[PDB]
Design a protein around this ligand. Structure first.
Ligand SMILES: Nc1ncnc2c1ncn2[C@@H]1O[C@H](CSCC[C@H](N)C(=O)O)[C@@H](O)[C@H]1O
Ligand code: NI
Ligand code: NI
Ligand SMILES: [Zn+2]
Ligand SMILES: [Zn+2]
Ligand SMILES: [Zn+2]
Length: 430
């Protein structure tokens, strides 16, 4: 089956890719991909529906496990062939049931291949079986991690799946690591993980021409730039706030390729991204190389500390790190912004609304200067600052920030996306 107005071609040096045949304007929808296989992240059960992802109050709990909710019984029955892979296992394993989301999603992919071997509507251009794996590029540490996931798959999903051999399972796992998507809500909060075959056919660019948004469990690809007939459709696979070197470190590590787009070539946004303090005695080169090294290393240590250190301690880390950095860097620097965004999140947990709003206010502007025009990160930030304002009863400011969020969202999600009608109703109440 073909996908209208688009075409799968051979992108030189980028393997298989998707190009446009007709023109697409900013905001236009390229295509929609129903999810081939998906799973709702554990920290969201009860909040969202396990079948359609609809966010609602009062959802039908599952009688057997009491850990899976639905809007009604049609969603419960419709989700059974997939939920049964964990209902009983969740009750029998109890506190020992902790498969990694990657393992859960892969189990669902195996169940899907068994129930529907034929090509699905989610595979009109690219098929799950023909996914790029990058297995020959794997080293021993990465092969060891894929081995731990195969051990988890067998350990938790043996009641129903018919596993092939380790050769086939390390391939599928490499394929999921290369083409698996993560679903986020209107605030970029993680909801789940899914497999979107046709969507996984678009290569990466740091200057993307399309954004992927989700309408429930449906992928929607909308043009954020003008796409002319014959030019490739490009998506951003990573967080575009960081400098070139950081971006490619993530691209090479996770996707086995070194981007070459205009941005990675000329590195225009790099300067402002690593703004140095216009001091009287401007910092020395080696001082900057040393500060970038320290910053990158503390990013990693904070990722590690978020797993056992109390919020007070984490906040102390963002403050002390921002202290030591503020001597070479400007607050617009992406490393100061990183520590600040993390601090704002910690305040959001502690329910220190005013502290979270203060940090947000400080972050938003540089955030706009660093990301593209239509960026889901910028929109979700405006959305968060807007709901912070409205919660605290700052109607004027909340209305301004919310309007900014709807500005970008109308392009990315389309003007009729339920998220937008929801924010508009959010403006008509406080
Ligand atoms: N800009 C780019 N430069 C080189 N390779 C790219 C690229 N963008 C995507 N890729 C390749 O695309 C894979 C992502 S899945 C995207 C489609 C892929 N080209 C395929 O034929 O199946 C990456 O692992 C990498 O191999
Ligand atoms: Ni996770
Ligand atoms: Ni991706
Ligand atoms: Zn539902
Ligand atoms: Zn259940
Ligand atoms: Zn790039």
């Amino acid at each position: 089956e073909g996908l209208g107005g688009l075409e799968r071609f051979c992108s030189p040096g980028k393997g298989r890719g998707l190009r446009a045949l007709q023109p697409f304007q900013v905001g236009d929808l390229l295509f929609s991909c129903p999810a081939y296989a998906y799973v709702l992240t554990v920290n969201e059960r009860g909040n969202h529906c396990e079948y359609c992802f609809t966010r609602k109050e009062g959802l039908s709990k599952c009688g057997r496990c009491k850990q899976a909710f639905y809007c009604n019984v049609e969603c419960q029955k419709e989700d059974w062939p997939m939920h049964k892979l964990e209902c009983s296992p969740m009750v029998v394993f109890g506190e020992n049931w902790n498969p990694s989301e990657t393992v859960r999603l892969t189990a669902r992919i195996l169940a899907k291949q068994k129930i529907h071997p034929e090509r699905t509507p989610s595979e009109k251009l690219l098929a799950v079986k023909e996914f790029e794996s990058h297995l020959d590029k794997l080293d021993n540490e990465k092969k060891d991690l894929i081995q731990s996931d195969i051990a988890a798959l067998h350990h938790f999903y043996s009641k129903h799946l018919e596993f092939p051999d380790n050769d086939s399972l390390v391939v599928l796992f490499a394929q999921v690591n290369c083409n698996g998507f993560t679903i986020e809500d209107e605030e970029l909060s993680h909801l789940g993980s899914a497999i979107f075959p046709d969507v996984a056919l678009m290569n990466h660019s740091c200057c993307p021409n399309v954004i992927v948004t989700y309408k429930g469990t449906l992928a929607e690809v909308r043009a954020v730039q003008e796409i002319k007939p014959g030019e490739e459709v490009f998506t951003s696979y990573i967080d575009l706030l960081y400098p070139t070197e950081d971006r490619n470190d993530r691209l090479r590590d996770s996707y086995f390729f070194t981007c070459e787009c205009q941005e990675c070539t000329t590195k225009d946004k790099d300067k402002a991204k690593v703004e140095i303090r216009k001091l009287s005695d401007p910092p020395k080169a080696e001082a900057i190389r040393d500060m970038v090294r320290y910053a990158r290393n503390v990013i990693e240590e904070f990722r590690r500390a978020k797993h056992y250190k109390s919020p007070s301690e984490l906040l102390e880390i963002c403050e002390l790190s921002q202290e030591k950095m503020s001597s070479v860097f400007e607050d617009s620097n992406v490393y100061m912004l990183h520590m600040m965004y993390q601090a704002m999140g910690v305040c959001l947990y502690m329910q220190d609304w005013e502290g979270a709003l203060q940090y947000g206010q400080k972050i938003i502007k540089p955030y706009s200067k660093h990301y593209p025009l239509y960026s889901l990160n910028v929109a979700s930030m405006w959305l968060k600052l807007g709901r912070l304002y409205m919660g605290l009863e700052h109607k004027a400011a909340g209305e301004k920030a919310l309007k900014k969020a709807i500005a970008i969202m109308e392009v990315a999600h389309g003007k009729d996306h339920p998220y937008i009608s929801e924010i508009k109703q959010e403006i008509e109440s406080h």
